[PDB]
C-alpha cells in the first residue's frame, strides 16, 4: 500500500534563513543544536548532491540506532528538499521506503511554515505503524525547535 | 493550518459494484448493515448529488451525536465521491472542515482499492487531533467491512 501524510508546522524564523540552517547545513547543525537527539550525520556515498547517501546516527536509548537517507533533490529557489528513507529506522518488516518532501514557505508576518510530506510504501494490505508516524512527528518537531532556538540566540548565524 | 491524510484500502468487491453499494446507496445500506456504527442518514437538502447536505446520526455512547456532510461531486464513470464534513462530530474548537475525496479503482484480481484523501482545515498553528484520524479510519474500515459482508451474502444486490 501507499500512505501519504502532509503536515504544516509554523516557525518564527524567516524562510530563507531557515532553509540555509535546517536544510542546507543540517548535517552540521543538527548534531550541534540537538546532540541529545542526533549523534552524527555522515556521507556514505556522494557529496551532498542528488543521489548522495547519508547516515544519521541516534544516541543509545532511542528506538532506532540509525537511518540512511538518499538525497533526491535540493531546490534553492523554492526552498524544497526531497529525500528518501531507505535503510534503518522504521525500514523493515512491512515498510520498504519513506519518500519525503520538506518545503519551507515564507508567511506574511515574516516567519515561515514547513510543509512536509511523508509517503510510506508498505507491504500489500499492511498499514503504517502509527507509533512510528507519531515518533517521526516528535523527532522532527524537536529538531526544528532546537534549530529555531539556536538561530534566535545567534543573529549572525545563517545571515 | 492544513493537514492531508491519503490512504489505500483493499476490497474484494469489484469497483463498479462497490461504488453502487458503498457510495451510491450508502444512505440506505449503512444503518441496515452497520447499526452499531451508523443510526441514520437523512438528506437535509437534495437527494444525494452535488450540493446535498446529509445528517448522519451515530449510536448512543459514540463520542459524537451526528455529523453534517455536504456532497461536493459524484463521478459515476470514474467512481469518484467528494464530500465535506461541515458540522457536528469533530467540527468545532480548532477544526473548521474536513474535505474528503474517495476514488475506487479496479485491481487485476477482480477486486478494488479505495483511495481516500482527508484534508483538515485547522485553526492557525493547531494540529489535527490524532484521535480524530484514528476514529475516521476505524469508522471507514467498519463500514466497508459491513458492506462487503452484505454484498458477499447477497450476490444479486447491486450487480
Numbering used by the authors:
A (entry chain A), B (entry chain B): 1 to 159
How is this structure described in the published paper?
Partly conflicting data on the allergenic significance of dimerization were reported for the birch pollen allergen Bet v 1, an outstandingly well characterized model system in immunology. It is the archetypical representative of the pathogenesis related protein family 10. Here, we report crystal structures of dimeric Bet v 1, revealing a noncanonical incorporation of cysteine at position 5 instead of genetically encoded tyrosine. Cysteine polysulfide bridging stabilized different dimeric assemblies, depending on the polysulfide linker length.
We hypothesized that this linker density is related to the observed redox dependence of the dimer. Residues 5A and 5B were no longer connected, but the linker electron density apparently vanished upon reduction. The resulting electron density at position 5 could be consistently interpreted as cysteine. The reduction was accompanied by a reorientation of the neighboring Phe3 side chains in both monomers for ∼170°, now partly occupying the position of the phenol rings of tyrosine observed in WT Bet v 1.
